[PDB]
Amino acid sequence: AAANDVNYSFDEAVSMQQGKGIVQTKEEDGKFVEANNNEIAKAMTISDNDMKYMDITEKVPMSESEVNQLLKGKGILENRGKVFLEAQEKYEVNVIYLVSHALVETGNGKSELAKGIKDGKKRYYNFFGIGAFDSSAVRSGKSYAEKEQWTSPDKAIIGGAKFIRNEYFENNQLNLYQMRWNPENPAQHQYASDIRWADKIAKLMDKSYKQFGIKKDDIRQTYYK
């Protein structure tokens, strides 16, 4: 019956995002530091061709050749376009979004962490920042990548898409803004602490859209009372 997800005023949501102990970060002087209250408030204000506000739960017409063009020179992700498109079709996840999120998270496919974490005779991979992903967490089995047996790059790509679909898109977090700021339930179930997480992914998405001439899906700009 009720499909009304506009639950809070902006000022109420801001106060929640500023709440006790809540980690919100910003890049400064080469590293991440805690964002202040004004920076958090500015970051969540509603204002890259609105790619942050675009539904990413639909598919785009990108061939494996086109996806591999985006992944050329992208380290461990190079020449994995066919698997990104398996993920798009299996889970109904926009493949330009999926590629853009992986490229931001993995440093263009070239970070040391993107090469995975060893445990016993296996290596675990994680291209989307899902759950805890370091040697401690992997050794102790308190790592989502290990729980889901993401034991190859291809498994991490399919599995990341499955996670995003089942945990975010099926939770009515349908665009980057909602993933980051969850305005229906502020400060809960948010993808990242970086206050410009959405902006980084959206900037790459907009470049890829304009590179291939892709039509934008629905843009939503009303989230608050």
Burial of 214 (0-12, 13-18, 19+ CB in 10 A): middle
Q: Which is nearer to Cl ion, 104 or 198 (CB)?
A: 198
With CB under 5 A as the contact rule, the residue among 18, 185, 193, 216 that binds Cl ion is 185
Question: Which residue is closest to Cl ion by CB?
Answer: 131
Nearest to 117 by CA among 85, 142, 82: 142
As given in the structure block, the two tokens for residue 3 are: 């499909």
Rounded Cα distance between 122 and 53, Å, is 39
With CB under 5 A as the contact rule, the residue among 189, 203, 207, 220 that binds Cl ion is 189
Rounded Cα distance between 191 and 193, Å, is 7
Q: Does 8 bind Cl ion (CB under 5 A)?
A: no
With CB under 5 A as the contact rule, the residue among 198, 201, 202, 204 that binds Cl ion is 198
Write b or e for each residue in 87-97: b if 16 or more Cβ atoms lie within 10 A of its Cβ, otherwise e. bbeebebbbbb
Using the contact rule CB under 5 A, the part of the chain among 23-31, 91-99, 100-108, 177-185 near Cl ion is: 177-185
Q: What angle do CA 104, 23, 183 make, to 5 degrees?
A: 80
Binding mask 119-138 for Cl ion (x = CB under 5 A): ------------xx------
Binding mask 49-88 for Cl ion (x = CB under 5 A): --------------xxx-------------x-xx------
With CB under 5 A as the contact rule, the residue among 128, 150, 169, 223 that binds Cl ion is 223
